[PDB]
């Protein structure tokens, strides 16, 4: 079992990208399967578009600075670009491509692949961004800390016109995680203490909802919206995943992984559209079928966990099944 | 407690073959006991014939490519054979020995050890094959993906020629098994919701079963000795039973306290009599006919369940013994 | 007159490929003439595509194992590939290149020249196959004798996977052919009395024809372009015609003065019009439509017969041209 | 095309044995096919029983002296017998095994394989023999030249291992001899091949006398039909004559195609009458009439099929032609 260095969903949440120390793999979610794989080398960044057989591959250090775009269906190379320093994050929509270094942001047109803009920002060792995947509201947000209280300043940048729109005074402390909804309407931010989750409306700039997370301060790994912006998912070092309902404070529903799971695991999640599930097979505790929101939680140890949430009841969520990635 | 790497029944379901990173062990089912053990090294595949003191040893990486056949009664080594790639699966009957690799299938005569035929197949990353254990209808079935996804090649080991090709499923095949008499074949798709049972002689689809209301992958399928029941184990920690006389006939619910990071297989035995007086709390006619079901998981526990042949339903657990100890 | 070693039509029946003990020749059918010739050496297998200046060269023993692909217009060699055993047969379509050995079948991409797949088959000492020349329905068939005698494996060249197995005949297979569109299949046993036509899509027996009242082995089978007629050639110095619309439709009787130590192949072409004025002495309307039939024999003579699509019966002979001269 | 050194039918005429310079082959007649083959080396004598998977192989020199008997179904060796001199002929029935050297005849029991008898005969450079294949009338006949009394033949009974009578067959040396299937008759011919005589082995009286050809020419082999109706002689004239024993001049004659090389050994056999379709074959009409089939194989490696009209006789039509080498 080789070590894995990178996991993320696609922009719709129906696929899996993964990077090992020996290669990368691509999975699927509902009819689970292994679409692609190569045992080329160490990969640190494997990001995919809305299917479409387009990938961004960054070597473990193929150096960490180099970025390679590969079409998996054609097994060809669209392009190859180098950077002076190691790449920290890569994100895409169907219009723009963004590469972030520790102090620089590069924006590329996805089609022509020519460089469009460059932003000189204050250092971001954590490689934090958030990209709206829709071209109607294509926005990029990146933190702007003072260069050495106003440490949690974030810059709202419009990719369409390549000009910033506004500056949001998000938090007092440094930003730890950022997420933009599918339509590019909302943005959610998390401080380094992970106690307060704040979501802002990107066009107006007003803070709409504020969530309290857990009991004591602890690190936050990632944030992600639902497809319909109904729920927000956060995962932290407490080995617990919280769901906040944006249909409008305290977390709406909580995901407790099995006890045998290691505590030192990076956990990312995703929320899918509600589906029909049979209550005859699963004693939820009864009509034969009821809609339950499926949640997929893949951890850095290499396992996938499927949960269901009742939108009215909420509460602690039942776990249906567990696969094992890399097997 | 060393980690285990291989767990499997024998061709009759009356034994447990288990190989650890330190050695291998051979158990029994009804009179539970430790028949044999050796602390030699890491073993990846330990396959046994119908008792008869015959074993096949595959090293964890003894390499994974190398295959060794030993006799436990005489403590001797029959032969050793190497392969260009890692060994993925091995199955045996009283006439033929077959070794499956990533893209090749090797067929051996179990008596002489001479090579008989080699099949060039499209890649099988899951190491999937199924063998009829009876020499009367000695068949081999393996999937044929395109290089039309669930094509299964019914290969006749008796004359070393394929017999027919069945379009089993539209998607990838996940698990295949052949009955004890070699008459029927069962397969499950990669989405693990529909079970299809084929007549290996003609290829007609006979039975179709529903299972796995949500996305729970199917791992293993097994027939009973009389082929009356079909057992499917998935990743949902629940085992379904289908009757070959649609909806499942009976279900197995492992206790919740068990480790969830486990791989579970199962096998159904011939009906036996159980004593009520031995079990005062649960299951309380001094003796009743109940079909025994044995489920072993990778965490090292053997579970015994019993089902009422008429009522079915959720099955009780009589016992839970501890392998590796 | 150096002895010839190989005779074959092209995939359409409008050309002649012939190989001598001294070189190879390429003829034509309707305007009979010598298209090409080379005095290089002995050639045992000369196969041509649909014109396109592409040839397959196999040495007599260039050895029998080596295969050379040459372009006659550019006078250059595309590639040369060797094989462990002697080459038994070669067939082509516009997308795939197939080389058959005694126990193996090699499949190549006719464009990239890269090896695609290799099939392990039971020994075929006669070098038998049949290949569909149309890329749309590119199917390959080859016999599968036991190591159940007339089993032929239907192999899909497009996806490189077998599709189905048909129990063609109870005895050993003697000759096979596939129509131009790759839809139908024809087989003949070693008895030479029964001709069976199969549908590749389903596998059903479509037609059954009677032939060869005595022991005359069948040598070659060929479909017409429109698949209206099927011609079989044997060792009896007679060629029968069957209509795919029981008893044979028409028959060809070679002249008695010809050599008897001959192997004749045939290929039925598209119907054409013949001039009656050119032939006053035989067959006496100025012109009438007549289906041409071309029979070339190993003695070095090409024959042209014509059959009336309504009357059938014995076919008149128009011309007898001398190949190799 | 390898050089072939030996061709013989089985005792029933339904099979073909053959030996090349590289190995031996076994064919069949009605459903023609290659039952067996073996690429060992030069084989000089290949004799077979009534099918039953029993063969006798004599190497060209496996020296010419050595005799090896093999079961082809089991691919095993029964026994090997060595002799001081080269073997000239071997014939079998389901009871006895006979080995001829130039001056010695050895008789073995086919079952227990123990030696039974040995006859010291005057030299036979041509290795001539005729052996009855039926155990009810197991007889052996061999020539007895002096050391005018040249064509004397010794009638030897294999059952009791004693000579029965001496036949004063011909004035000159005997050239060929054969016995009917039931062991009742015997036919011999002198080295001139002008007179064919038939003697009854029971009494010794000459029954039939046939004239063959006009000028003295060599004779290769003589063979009866299975029903003892006809007798077949083959010679250097590239022509095969058939004499009707239902009772002088040959009843019907077989002419090979003119292309055939004239320096070819030819052995023939007559089969049981069967039905043929006159609709397909313009015999020049009832749809079917019974035609007696004759199979003629030549040393060049070809087989010829003729048909004989028992009433009309005359020159026989030829239906088909194969190749025994290659296929």
Numbering used by the authors:
A (entry chain A): 5 to 65, 70 to 156, 222 to 321, 409 to 445, 458 to 499
B (entry chain E), C (entry chain C): 5 to 65, 70 to 155, 223 to 320, 409 to 447, 459 to 499
D (entry chain D): 5 to 65, 70 to 155, 222 to 321, 409 to 445, 458 to 500
From the paper:
In an effort to improve the helical order, we imaged the previously characterized Atg18-P72A/R73A (PR72AA) mutant that has lost its ability to interact with Atg241. The corresponding Fourier transforms supported the same structural organization of both helical assemblies, with an improved helical ordering in the Atg18-PR72AA mutant over the Atg18-WT, indicated by the higher diffracting layer line at 1/6 Å. D Fourier shell correlation threshold at 0.143 indicates resolutions of 3.8 and 3.3 Å for the 3D structures of Atg18-WT and Atg18-PR72AA, respectively. The helical symmetry unit is illustrated with alternating blue/white colors (pitch: 100 Å, number of units per turn 5.1; helical rise: 19.4 Å, rotation 70.0°). The T-interface includes R285 and R286 of the FRRG motif that are in direct contact with blade 6 of the adjacent molecule. The I-interface is located between blade 3 and blade 4 due to a 180° disc rotation a pseudo dihedral symmetry including in a small tilt of the two discs with respect to each other. Notably, four T-interfaces are arranged in the characteristic lozenge pattern that was previously observed in the COPII coat formed by Sec31 tetramers. In fact, the T-interface buries the PI3P/PI(3,5)P2 FRRG binding interface and shows direct competition between PIP binding and tube formation. Similarly, Atg18 phosphorylations in loop 7AB can be expected to affect the stability of the tubular assembly, in particular, as the higher resolution structure of Atg2-binding deficient mutant Atg18-PR72AA tubes suggested an increased rigidity over Atg18-WT.
Autophagy-related protein 18 (Atg18) participates in the elongation of early autophagosomal structures in concert with Atg2 and Atg9 complexes. Atg18 belongs to the protein family of β-propellers that bind polyphosphoinositides (PROPPIN). The corresponding primary structure contains a series of conserved WD40 repeats forming the 6 or 7 blades of a β-propeller fold. The autophagic membrane adapter Atg18 reveals an unexpected structural plasticity in multiple modes of oligomeric organization.
